From Swiss-Prot:
It comes from the Eukaryota. Belongs to the inositol 1,4,5-trisphosphate 5-phosphatase family. Phosphatidylinositol (PtdIns) phosphatase that specifically hydrolyzes the 5-phosphate of phosphatidylinositol-3,4,5-trisphosphate (PtdIns(3,4,5)P3) to produce PtdIns(3,4)P2, thereby negatively regulating the PI3K (phosphoinositide 3-kinase) pathways. Able also to hydrolyzes the 5-phosphate of phosphatidylinositol-4,5-bisphosphate (PtdIns(4,5)P3) and inositol 1,3,4,5-tetrakisphosphate. Acts as a negative regulator of B-cell antigen receptor signaling. Tyrosine phosphorylated by the members of the SRC family after exposure to a diverse array of extracellular stimuli such as cytokines, growth factors, antibodies, chemokines, integrin ligands and hypertonic and oxidative stress. Phosphorylated upon IgG receptor FCGR2B-binding. The chain holds residues 398 to 857 of 1189 of the full protein. The SH2 domain interacts with tyrosine phosphorylated forms of proteins such as SHC1 or PTPN11/SHP-2. It competes with that of GRB2 for binding to phosphorylated SHC1 to inhibit the Ras pathway. It is also required for tyrosine phosphorylation. The NPXY sequence motif found in many tyrosine-phosphorylated proteins is required for the specific binding of the PID domain. Specifically expressed in immune and hematopoietic cells. Expressed in bone marrow and blood cells. Levels vary considerably within this compartment. Present in at least 74% of immature CD34+ cells, whereas within the more mature population of CD33+ cells, it is present in only 10% of cells. Present in the majority of T-cells, while it is present in a minority of B-cells (at protein level). It is found in: Cytoplasm; Cell membrane; Membrane raft; Cytoplasm, Cytoskeleton. This is Phosphatidylinositol 3,4,5-trisphosphate 5-phosphatase 1. Interacts with tyrosine phosphorylated form of SHC1. Interacts with tyrosine phosphorylated form of DOK1. Interacts with tyrosine phosphorylated form of DOK3. Interacts with tyrosine phosphorylated form of SLAMF1/CD150. Interacts with PTPN11 in response to IL-3. Interacts with receptor EPOR. Interacts with receptors MS4A2/FCER1B and FCER1G. Interacts with receptors FCGR2B and FCGR3. Interacts with receptor FCGR2A, leading to regulate gene expression during the phagocytic process. Interacts with GRB2. Interacts with PLCG1. Interacts with tyrosine kinases SRC and TEC. Interacts with c-Met/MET.
Length: 460
């Protein structure tokens, strides 16, 4: 039975509004409703992995798992296995996988982050799951961010706290946050970003939605504008939105948006918004294709509609050679040539690099670089041809060209990372000097760049 080189992943996000679900929720898992929807001809084909994020979820874990499994079994005639379930307050993540994937799944991790301080601490935050699928690391974050149209900056802060503090994936990747630990990272939830238009324009917005004319609304969506200004979700992707705003509906119909201020809302307006979102970030040159992104039309127990997204995701096999794992394969080498980091920092410490990758027995520390001043103010750290030659565990090009090198640039004085990035080994040529590049981030914000040349030797 061959190992797969691609799987499909379902991501769902639903703010259930503290109400139990209706008896049938299959439309969600079938990607049917509004937006980019799934072909009817695929309805019986199971996804490999289903990841369900809920917010304002009133059910017990047991109650929701029974509904989910019975839903999938009705669609696919497959009894899915539970990979993980984790709940913080009313924020929950469930990961289910086809039983044939049991032997392929390992290193299952869960964690949560509570985002608020005092007043603000006690119901917002995030849950997450990670695991390995054969040679591929997968991370999943369900976040419920701060509500209210005038709190976009709090939402951005909530995002940075979650990616700093959520402890998923390989703890040996100590310089790296979740935005660098996974081949594929999916971040979804009730992100709570709103369409920023005047209150007086509510009925105009409703009209636009009834005409399915979303362009002048999406141009005011706070998540799209904050992303375009590099204030949040730097280096993540989102499919184009082609479904109506998923909040705030009157319950038991989808015919009415309930936007007007009420005591129950804290006297805040809830103009129709795309609160409920799915974003992803995959390592460079790994296959990831969104095959659906939309909302259901027939699940009406909440003031939100469920959102679905599905993905093709490239995966790699576990590799065993005569040599690695458990020795190097001297037929393999990675040389980083004429590299330099450009940093935005005002500090004047010396810096060194660390190279981390599951193609190495353990991470590699470089010598200190040579600091120079850039023409426009910047620190430039030069490494020359001084960098340690990296010795991968397997030299077979079918393995090595699918790997990635994580890079951290660290202060000699503090051993703190000033920037993290990732380089693909999916090169146009081996035994050939080729340009490489990554942006460098720290706490998910841009802090610099790393560029230079690579020379990769494989057994071919
Ligand atoms: C589908 C599923 C759910 C939960 C766990 C797993 N698989 C594993 O944990 C494998 C079994 C042997 C060691 N690792 N698969």
């Amino acid at each position: 039975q061959p190992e797969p080189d691609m799987i499909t992943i379902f991501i769902g996000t639903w703010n259930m509004g503290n109400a139990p679900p209706p008896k049938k929720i299959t439309s969600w898992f079938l990607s049917k409703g509004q937006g980019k929807t799934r072909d009817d001809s695929a309805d019986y084909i199971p996804h490999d992995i289903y990841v369900i994020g809920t917010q304002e979820d009133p059910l017990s874990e047991k109650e929701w798992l029974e509904i989910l499994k019975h839903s999938l079994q009705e669609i696919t005639s497959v009894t899915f296995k539970t990979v993980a379930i984790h709940t913080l307050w009313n924020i929950r993540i469930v990961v289910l996988a086809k039983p044939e994937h049991e032997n392929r799944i390992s290193h299952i991790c869960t964690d949560n982050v509570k985002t608020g301080i005092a007043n603000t601490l006690g119901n917002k935050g995030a849950v997450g799951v990670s695991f390995m699928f054969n040679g591929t690391s997968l991370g999943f974050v369900n976040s419920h961010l701060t509500s209210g149209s005038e709190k976009k900056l709090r939402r951005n802060q909530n995002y940075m706290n979650i990616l700093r503090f959520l402890a998923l994936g390989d703890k040996k990747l100590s310089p790296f946050n979740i935005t660098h630990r996974f081949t594929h990272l999916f971040w979804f939830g009730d992100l709570n970003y709103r369409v920023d238009l005047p209150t007086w324009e509510a009925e105009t917005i409703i009209q636009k939605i009834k005409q399915q004319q979303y362009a002048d609304l999406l141009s005011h969506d706070q998540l799209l504008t904050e992303r375009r200004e590099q204030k949040v979700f730097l280096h993540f992707e989102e499919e184009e939105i082609t479904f109506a705003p998923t909040y705030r509906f009157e319950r038991l119909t989808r015919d009415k948006y309930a936007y007007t201020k009420q005591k129950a809302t804290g006297m805040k307006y809830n103009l129709p918004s795309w609160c409920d979102r799915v974003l992803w970030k995959s390592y460079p040159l790994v296959h990831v294709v969104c095959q659906s992104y939309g909302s259901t039309s027939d699940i009406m127990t909440s003031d939100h509609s469920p959102v679905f997204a599905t993905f093709e995701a490239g995966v790699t096999s576990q590799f065993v050679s005569k040599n690695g794992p458990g020795t190097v394969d001297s037929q393999g080498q990675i040389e980083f040539l004429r590299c330099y980091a450009t940093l935005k920092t005002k500090s004047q410490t010396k810096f060194y690099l660390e190279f981390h990758s599951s193609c190495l027995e353990s991470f590699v520390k470089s010598q200190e670089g040579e600091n120079e001043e850039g023409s426009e103010g910047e620190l430039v750290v030069k490494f020359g041809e001084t960098l340690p030659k990296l010795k991968p565990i397997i030299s077979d090009p079918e393995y090595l060209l699918d790997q990635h090198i994580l890079i951290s640039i660290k202060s000699s004085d503090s051993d703190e990372s000033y920037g993290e990035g990732c380089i693909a080994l999916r090169l146009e040529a081996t035994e050939t000097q080729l340009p490489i590049y990554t942006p460098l981030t720290h706490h998910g914000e841009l802090t610099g760049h790393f560029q230079g040349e690579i020379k990769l030797q494989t057994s071919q």
